[PDB]
Symmetry: C3
Subunit: 284 residues, 3 copies
């Protein structure tokens, strides 16, 4: 079910191709194996079911390998990691690698504590990843940026040096790096894009971020190029979030949480075509 | 406490008797000890609270034996299982048996992987069960396939094959077998019933089946005959789902999830009497 | 960030001062580290996010010390514990203690089973607590090493004996004791208050109590006087629950769960001033 829905030889990734990927997810209901934190497991599964994917949440070493093996994508999230779950994630990642299943990493809290930073780095050393998604700090810490340089994230900033961090990190780890923010910056070794969808209410719902990473997994299962897959996923998810906000921006974060799930099921190819904002960043 | 809301010497189980069991559940607020997967613990607990029961989710070896012995019913779900949790489920199950607390099993995943099938079998070997609720495949592979034939040209269920599977499984394991699906077939060693309630939206909410098994548990806690208890529980849950689907309309799976919780609390004896579709299967 | 919004000498805690504490919480978005169970993690995090605080869940012994020391408050919940998590809670508590991070304990289930009771006692023995939030029974069973330790009179419901219960516990443990119920009783070594807000629907939402305890943590992070912090936290939460129940009307606990999240976000400083019912108990 992993086809090719866009190529740079036909132009830059756009809203049209993004909408096509969304259709593919619905059509194939890809199995997405998520080994995520226990604060967002339920929401992750429901978000994927709403979208149209098939969530599988096995996490024990007694079954992760055989499950990742037959999944369309594997998503690892270290939100409430333990020595045991990090080992299970790596066992799962190695099985996925052996069977050509794309693996996505969400380094939640990388940099907050040493254990998280080192676990993220252990996963990257032992597992070939198709994409990594996190905020600027988590990515910086995960890829090994020097301590004192990290400061270049605080204060008011959301466009510029983040573009370089994303491409440079993608080149060092030969993967796709998605740096989350109001404006998302995504890049692989040779290409960079900025994404402008979503709504601030997402910051008031736990798992909103974790769900997106798993959503990226759903798209990588149906689109061969993870850069295109991730752009289509983030765009579709953001459009759904905007439509959800429209109907529940005044009710509150509780209603929005529910509305996000509603919209992931009702968002259409036409909505993505009309609202997705994807911009190619010139790199030369 | 426990009681008898119906007897076969007293006609076939019906909507009226089902409605009475529902009232009994709310009147007694039975302690339902559910050991389930981390993807549905919250939804399971909320569903039970909405219904009118008192959930307890202890899962650790250090306390499951103590919690199970004072509960009205013990429910075991094998999702996202591990060697560790299976052992705890057995300790809990034996404690429940020693104190006359009914145990209900949900063999989710049985037949899909060896660890699940063996774990389900391990529980059956060590714990006496009041009922087992799962889909056709999970029940067939758990019990072991002895009858293969069903119907030529794959299309649907059949019209008697699932009915045979249930009664034979019930006779082999000497328990109540509830095969769930768009038709629900419940049977014990000498009686079989088909249930026709519910709504497709349930497939879009994680923990749907998980919760249903626990609801069966709540009903087993107040009705002596597990066959009647399961019928009443499944009928009540299904009617609530139908009402929730009607209120939800086209809002989406998020709204339906919240509505199912709402309806598990607002569904009345009258709604059950009016909408529960229970049919006793004639077996000459 | 533990500042003072009410200097104790100008008068007792009131609805006006409690309201200002709420604004302080939203102004600082305190990092609340919660070590709790998967049945209530998601609601606890979403509730804190709605309120205006920043939730972080970390349980691994490899990182709890590091996470607790940078948190604004540490909250320990023994809900569905394991020998492993209790070990981690104590490690985190000791770290918090060495760095002046307030620690709040929710002794859920203490007394209902042996392991839970003992685990509650080990924590209090090894960790200095800023406050303990539980019901009359849990508080009694947790402080009552002997069956005579707690003196007074036994009867239905309770409150006065509850007042003496709270003072005895506060002085014995040298902390703030928050005994929740229809009417809340809160006391430290010198003062006692009764709070009259909230709604019965809270008993129909799993994680309602767990969330309240973590909310107390959020207020303790910004208000230096733990007694005042607990009062402001419980009052804000209760008022939000009242507005939520009104908004819900008679839809059901599903809608209430969502509306409670909405209101924790939309409840204003003015709402607390108007609805908060705080009464200083005259101790002669």
């Amino acid at each position: 079910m992993r086809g090719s829905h866009h190529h740079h030889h036909h132009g830059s990734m756009d809203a049209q191709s993004a909408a096509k990927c969304l259709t593919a997810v619905r059509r194939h209901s890809p199995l997405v194996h998520s080994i995520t934190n226990n604060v967002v497991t339920n929401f992750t599964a429901n978000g994927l079911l709403a979208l149209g994917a098939s969530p599988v949440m096995a996490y024990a070493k007694e079954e992760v390998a055989d499950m990742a093996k037959i999944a369309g994508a594997l998503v690892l999230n270290i939100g409430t990691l333990s020595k045991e779950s990090v080992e299970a994630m790596i066992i799962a990642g190695k099985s996925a690698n052996e069977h050509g299943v794309p693996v996505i990493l969400d380094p939640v809290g990388a940099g907050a504590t040493p254990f998280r930073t080192e676990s993220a780095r252990d996963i990257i050393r032992e597992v070939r990843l198709a994409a990594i998604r996190g905020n600027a700090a988590e990515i910086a810490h995960t890829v090994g940026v020097t301590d004192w340089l990290i400061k270049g994230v605080d204060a008011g900033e959301g466009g510029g040096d983040i573009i370089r961090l994303a491409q440079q990190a993608a080149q060092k780890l030969n993967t796709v790096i998605a740096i989350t923010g109001e404006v998302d910056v995504i890049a692989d070794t040779s290409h960079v894009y900025t994404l402008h969808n979503g709504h601030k209410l997402l910051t008031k719902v736990t798992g909103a971020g974790s769900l997106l990473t798993s959503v990226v997994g759903a798209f990588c299962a149906v689109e061969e190029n993870p850069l295109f897959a991730a752009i289509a996923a983030i765009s579709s998810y953001g459009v759904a979030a905007q439509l959800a906000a429209q109907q529940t921006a005044d009710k509150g974060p509780g209603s929005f949480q529910i509305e996000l799930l509603n919209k992931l099921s009702t968002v259409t190819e036409q909505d993505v075509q009309e609202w997705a904002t994807i911009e190619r960043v010139t790199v030369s």
